[PDB]
Amino acid sequence: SITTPEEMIEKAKGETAYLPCKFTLSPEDQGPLDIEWLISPADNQKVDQVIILYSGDKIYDDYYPDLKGRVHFTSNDLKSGDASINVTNLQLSDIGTYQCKVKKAPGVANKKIHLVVL
Amino acid sequence: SITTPEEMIEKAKGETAYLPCKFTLSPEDQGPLDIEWLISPADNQKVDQVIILYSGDKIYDDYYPDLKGRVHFTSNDLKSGDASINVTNLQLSDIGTYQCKVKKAPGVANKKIHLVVL
Amino acid sequence: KVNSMEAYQIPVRSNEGSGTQVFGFPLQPGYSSVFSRTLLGEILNYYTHWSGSIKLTFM
Amino acid sequence: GYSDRARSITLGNSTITTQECANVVVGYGVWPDYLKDSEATAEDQPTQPDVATCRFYTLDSVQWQKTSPGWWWKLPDALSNLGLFGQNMQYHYLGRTGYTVHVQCNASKFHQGCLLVVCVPEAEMGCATLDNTPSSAELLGGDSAKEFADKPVASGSNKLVQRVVYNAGMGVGVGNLTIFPHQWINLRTNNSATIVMPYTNSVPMDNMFRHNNVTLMVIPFVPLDYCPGSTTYVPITVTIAPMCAEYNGLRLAGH
Amino acid sequence: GYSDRARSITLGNSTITTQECANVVVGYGVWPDYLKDSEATAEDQPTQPDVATCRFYTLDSVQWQKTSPGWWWKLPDALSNLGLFGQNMQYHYLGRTGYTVHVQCNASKFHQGCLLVVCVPEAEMGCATLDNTPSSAELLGGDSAKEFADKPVASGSNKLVQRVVYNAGMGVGVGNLTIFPHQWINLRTNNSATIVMPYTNSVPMDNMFRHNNVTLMVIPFVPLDYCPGSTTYVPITVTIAPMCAEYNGLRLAGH
Amino acid sequence: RVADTVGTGPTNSEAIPALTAAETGHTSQVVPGDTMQTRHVKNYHSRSESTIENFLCRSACVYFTEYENSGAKRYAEWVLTPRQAAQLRRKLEFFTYVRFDLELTFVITSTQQPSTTQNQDAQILTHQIMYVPPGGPVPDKVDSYVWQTSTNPSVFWTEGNAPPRMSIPFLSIGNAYSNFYDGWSEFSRNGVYGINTLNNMGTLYARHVNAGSTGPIKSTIRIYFKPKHVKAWIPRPPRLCQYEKAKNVNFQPSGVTTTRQSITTMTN
Amino acid sequence: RVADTVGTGPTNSEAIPALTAAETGHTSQVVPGDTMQTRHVKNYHSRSESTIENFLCRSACVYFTEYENSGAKRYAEWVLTPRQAAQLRRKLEFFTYVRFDLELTFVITSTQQPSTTQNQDAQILTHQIMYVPPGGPVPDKVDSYVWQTSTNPSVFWTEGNAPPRMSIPFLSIGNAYSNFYDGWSEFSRNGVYGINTLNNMGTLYARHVNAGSTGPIKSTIRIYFKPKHVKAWIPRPPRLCQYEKAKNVNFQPSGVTTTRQSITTMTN
Amino acid sequence: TSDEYTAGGFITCWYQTNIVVPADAQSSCYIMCFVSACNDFSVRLLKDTPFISQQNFF
Amino acid sequence: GAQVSTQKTGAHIHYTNINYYKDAASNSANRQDFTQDPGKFTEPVKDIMIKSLPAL
Amino acid sequence: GAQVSTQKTGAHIHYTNINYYKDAASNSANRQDFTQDPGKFTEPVKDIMIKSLPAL
């Protein structure tokens, strides 16, 4: 269960966009926690491209070149419901669809955020 | 169930032939209503050729070229038992066998009308 | 009117005439559109046969 | 020689008097009472103020216009900021209470209109997004009355409750709302509607903050109409009094 | 706790309901009953349909204008073309029946008017010629209501009934019409008038075609009046139900 | 059984049963005899099939999923919830709180997939279905150690036999299951609205005990839910619009009912 | 049991039992002893097998249809009516009105069709038969949502097991089923003559739950109708000519009986 | 379900008398209809409701 | 609640039957129900006709 | 310990049932449980209303 999974965020250029993907786990959920942030470009090029991954209690920040050292998890707990990321340098390219996936067996939850930069 | 399914209609040339295909539905019938008017030519050429079709609450009037803008459903309800058509301009060619099919799952009903023009 | 609260209301007025019809509908609670959605009609759609009297209250 | 359409209810230090009422609907035939020692769960002694908590609390009035779609209230939430009742729950973990809903509206013989007063328990309301859930602010309006929308609420990416009056936000026929305890006010026969509701929940007692047991909805099936030179402004006052309230789980105030 | 001015009459499969009535006038104190074996004459077994024949039959309405002189009906003749009752007499030589006359008329408090409802047996009516007798068509109007004339009918050579309202066509004072069973409708007190009439005739049973036992007359002593912006059209509906009807002399239909 | 009609005669009196007030919220309950002449009738009709036990006690397919004997997907996991199927769900949503016993029946069928494999010999396929309680460990892989089912109830079924069936007792921390929850799980009201710790039963895991054949095989498992000893409280209006999401009562605004050509019309 | 013959002696008297009148419509009921000398005989024969319960309570095939695991035709639908088979039908038409309980048994057999498909592996085929009441929704396609059977009785059968059997109670709005209806459904008499709302039971839908094999398979389902607790009213003459249409008693004129060379002839 | 053989009947409403109102009063009103069953109403043959439809699982 | 009844036997023994369903229409056929009343079909006349006496 | 009960039959016979599990939730449905109490839904008013007497 992710709060407000479908939503749209609007921010000006260079304003630092914070994407909220706070979740809540059911009793049945007892599997390993796996977070996957995949971005779909507005360019209409190949979609479902991953940017940042959190698995095995470890973080990977190199899955998409354009965002190099710009995506960091806002919270350091991460196991806690709050699993959010913030882009420091908002750019014209940033415009696109961002999908947040929280996978704890059994049950997978997904959140989609439309990002527009003025 | 179609009233008098087998019958023969006799009319003079240019007299406007009205073909009656009034049906009655059983309780079991609960499927989509599909009407299909197919004509078998007296020419002895390919038979079972459709002229006018009523499906998805829509009417198609272009399945046989000879009858162009000449076959119209007499009743505008159509869902009501009365599902009849009338040819405005009777011609020498008109002579042939006309079959009316009322299909509402479960159960299919068929009516055959022999048309002779004097 | 079925998309508004006006479907339930029934109109009447002062008319220079008599014997006119306020409304008319058949006795088909299970099938008729008017009763197909009432507490009675909604329950009558899970059964095949129905036998009994019906009460109509006009306010 | 009493009159059938004449009544008076006295709770705490407040008295209401109606000289034109239809009757009193006592829920599903159950009268508000305290928790028995057989169905209880919390081992700690329950605290019952009784006089302070149980008394009539008058909410803000609303205007009945000719195009008014309807209004709704959350009974536990509505009284959360009023009197000791509001304070009591702020300091208590559990809470079990019953209510008496007296909707008041009056008009002249010439004025013609009709309203529906109904109490709907566990009224879970839908959202226009069809993927999100309604926000707390949109669903709950303390010290106010949330209104219904005639035209359907626009669908987009947000948290707005579908206020559609015909589905009533529960995706059900508005006409089928009479199954729950209800009463009708017609300006040709009634001047008020009084309903007594017993506490109804699956659990013996529940949190009064995040959880709302019942919901009061006032909807006009037939609109308000009148000729010129008549009174244009017609208000509606809702008075709600808790009955047999009791709380458990004393703690620091907050939510 | 019933209301004196509230009533309901149930005959056959028809029910009338009045929420503003004065009382019920039962003729001369006699209630409609069947023929006894001592006062009977026709030796053949009488046929009594009972449910079909005895039931409320609503005639066409009339308009009460400010200059309306009055209307009249022939009870046996009026119902001759309606339901089984009409058919039954068409096939029977003799017929004996009683009636219940419920005249209905309603108006607002602001409207003011007055009407007289009276049943006159054997109402032989005069003719303007003073040498001829009124025609069947002029005297009897099946599926219609014959009206009275304010100004006197012109005298000539013809068959026209003197419709003079003041003599009422019987050459008697209109004010002396209260001797027969009657009731008054005033739009300030009454909304209807109900009268029960027992069968009255010299013979035990009589032909229902050429002979009419009773006659219903509605006359307004004080005219209908109201201020502008009020309802101009005011109708009057007459509902008549046969009671304890029975027929003798089965034959081929006709008259 | 039902009430017997009572014979009546024409009545003229002050009593007015038909006249009443609907504002009181009281049903008039007027019999046919009050407004018309009836004949005594001895009704023998009985309201047997309209009972809640008769209405809700039928097997209804709630969810079907498939697994393979090879490839990536080797096992199927489903959490117990009856909102998956609109039919059984709509019947259950008729009331607010329902308490009942549950009976589970599973139908399993295996279909051979197209392949270039030759000399395929198939051995009677055995399927294992394991039920996991809330908070219990969930198997990561098909050949995981969890499938030991020491304290987890599990059933082994061999093809060509009657479908496996087990009876579950009412499980709910609360006194009764809640169909509709108005509120938030969080005391701060910052979570998915309508989420409840109530109505949580468990998770079902289905896999092939043995590969059986060299060639690929895919099997679909259908779960049937039959309520027993059911109890109902607070009746509510039936669903008028089509279900969109199982989690929330979110709906699309729908016409109160179907239209007709005009009033006074006897047909649709 | 039957009546025992009574011993008689030569009798000369005015009594004339043999002489009678057939115009009265009364059967003479003359025993052998009235017209000839007989010996007392203790008959032990019993009329047990001639009872209606014994005559009509046997399983008779009424209709068989087929479906495939692939291709256009994937499911088979038949409306319940016993006029499909002449045998059971003729026995039932002996009376005017018959009231009885019904028992249904289905025999299902699958035959592999010719195909160029290779490496065919077949999995035990499971067949689902669903009964739909009058006015109930009918499945548009094989993979339709209707097959959930929430409130519709359905039976799942796996090959290699005894045939599925269910018992149906007498269903008829009327007091008894009517074999022959004289009249029109329409009050205006402008419809198919003999059509009745009576004798309407339901529709049977049969399909394959799983494909089972890559190669094509065709299965034929046979429906058997066994009447139980039968009752009969108004006996009528047995059918003399062959049945043409199930809907109407339409027949072709047929010779009263077979001919012989002449009268006085002892052979056919 | 709709069936010609078992025809129910027709329910209609007419004006016995004209609506009468005074001055400064609306001449246009509305009526409400409430339909319930009697104490001799029964149903039989449990079947599924057509209204609810589903193409995929939720 | 077992019902013991006599089996069909020749002239010149017992069987026990139990009902496992409450449906009752789920029971077996009533094979042993032999009753004869042809009087209505053979003689539905108003006045009884004695064989010894002549018909007319 | 066998329970004998009456089968559902028409108007105008018996069945025996035994429980082989001590679980009790493993028993069959209580189909024969017909009880009617609509008074609460139809009339939940405080003062009883007589039909003969006028409502108000």
DSSP E222: S
Check CB contact under 8 Å for A8 and D159: no
Q: A67 to chain F, minimum CA–CA distance in Å?
A: 30
Distance CA G42, CA G202 (A): 52
Q: Is H6 on the interface with D (CB under 8 A)?
A: no
Residue of C8, E202, H35 lying closest to D223 (CA atoms): C8
Task: Name every chain I residue with its beta carbon within 8 A of the beta carbon of G59.
Answer: none
Distance CA E224, CA E235 (A): 12
H touches A (3+ CB pairs < 8 Å)?
no
Q: Is H23 on the interface with C (CB under 8 A)?
A: no
DSSP E178: G
Q: Is D180 within 8 Å of D121 (Cβ atoms)?
A: yes
The values of phi and psi at residue G15, to 5°, are -60, 135
Check CB contact under 8 Å for G138 and B1: no
Best of F54, F55, F95 to mutate (most J CBs within 10 Å, chain J): F54
Task: Name the residue with tokens 């004080």.
Answer: E222
G touches E (3+ CB pairs < 8 Å)?
no
Q: Is F47 within 8 Å of F3 (Cβ atoms)?
A: no
Q: H39 to chain C, minimum CA–CA distance in Å?
A: 8
Which among D183, D204, D210 has the least Cβ separation from residue F183?
D210
Q: Is G95 within 8 Å of G235 (Cβ atoms)?
A: yes
Distance CA D234, CA F167 (A): 60
List of residues 6+ apart from E224 with CB closer than 8 A: E64, E65, E66, E68, E107, E111, E112, E113, E187, E234
Q: H25 to chain F, minimum CA–CA distance in Å?
A: 23
Distance CA F74, CA H46 (A): 40
Angle, vertex CA J21, rays to CA J15 and CA J24, nearest 5: 85
Q: What residues in chain G have their Cβ under 8 A from chain C's Cβ atoms? A: 133-136, 151, 173
Backbone CA torsion sign across H3, H6, H8, H9 = positive
Task: Name the residue with tokens 């069987």.
Answer: I15
For residue D174, give the CATH number of its domain. 2.60.120.20
Distance CA G170, CA G230 (A): 10
Q: F144 to chain H, minimum CA–CA distance in Å?
A: 29
Task: Name every chain E residue with its beta carbon within 8 A of the beta carbon of J51.
Answer: none
Task: Name every chain B residue with its beta carbon within 8 A of the beta carbon of G244.
Answer: none
Entry resolution in angstroms?
3.2
Distance CA B115, CA B15 (A): 13
Task: Name every chain D residue with its beta carbon within 8 A of the beta carbon of A5.
Answer: 131-132
Check CB contact under 8 Å for F49 and H40: no
The values of phi and psi at residue A54, to 5°, are -125, 105
Touching F: which chains, 3+ CB pairs < 8 A?
Answer: A, C, D, E, G, H, J
Q: G113 to chain I, minimum CA–CA distance in Å?
A: 39
Helix (H) or strand (E) run with residue B86 in it: strand B85-87
What method was applied to determine this entry? Answer: cryo-EM
User: Could you give the C-alpha distances from A100 to A17, A109, D205, F193, in angstroms and in order?
Assistant: 15, 8, 37, 20
Q: What residues in chain H have their Cβ under 8 A from chain B's Cβ atoms? A: 1, 3-4, 50
Count E/F contacts: CB-CB distance under 8 Å: 47
Residue of D11, D118, D103 lying closest to D56 (CA atoms): D11
Check CB contact under 8 Å for G173 and C30: no
Count up the domains in chain D and report the number.
1
Residue of D24, D15, D80, D25 lying closest to D53 (CA atoms): D80
Check CB contact under 8 Å for H1 and B30: yes
A touches J (3+ CB pairs < 8 Å)?
no
Distance CA B14, CA B10 (A): 12
Best of B1, B23, B25, B104 to mutate (most H CBs within 10 Å, chain H): B25
User: Could you give the C-alpha distances from D7 to D2, D23, E68, F27, J49, in angstroms and in order?
Assistant: 9, 9, 48, 22, 16
Check CB contact under 8 Å for D167 and F180: no
D1 inside domain:
no
Residue of B65, E241, F240 lying closest to D164 (CA atoms): F240
Residue of B109, B4, B98, B115 lying closest to B51 (CA atoms): B98
Question: D133-148 burial string, b = 16+ CB within 10 Å, else e?
Answer: bbbbebbbbeeebbeb
Check CB contact under 8 Å for C9 and H30: yes
Task: Name every chain H residue with its beta carbon within 8 A of the beta carbon of C9.
Answer: 30-32
Distance CA J21, CA B15 (A): 82
| DSSP string covering F140-162 | SSTT-GGGG-SSS-EEEEETTSP
**The token pair that represents E209 in the structure block:** 């075609």
Count D/F contacts: CB-CB distance under 8 Å: 142
**The token pair that represents D74 in the structure block:** 């959350």
Count up the domains in chain G and report the number.
1
Check CB contact under 8 Å for C16 and E232: yes
Best of I9, I23, I31, I45 to mutate (most G CBs within 10 Å, chain G): I31
Q: I19 to chain G, minimum CA–CA distance in Å?
A: 14
User: Could you give the C-alpha distances from E39 to E49, F209, I17, in angstroms and in order?
Assistant: 21, 102, 72
Check CB contact under 8 Å for G77 and B106: yes
Q: Residue E219 is part of which domain span?
A: 7-250
Strands annotated E in D132-186: 146-147, 182-186
Check CB contact under 8 Å for J49 and F44: no
Q: C26 to chain G, minimum CA–CA distance in Å?
A: 16
**The token pair that represents B56 in the structure block:** 């998805």
Burial classification of residue G233, based on how many CB atoms lie within 10 Å of its CB (0-12 exposed, 13-18 middle, 19 or more buried): exposed
Check CB contact under 8 Å for E54 and F18: no
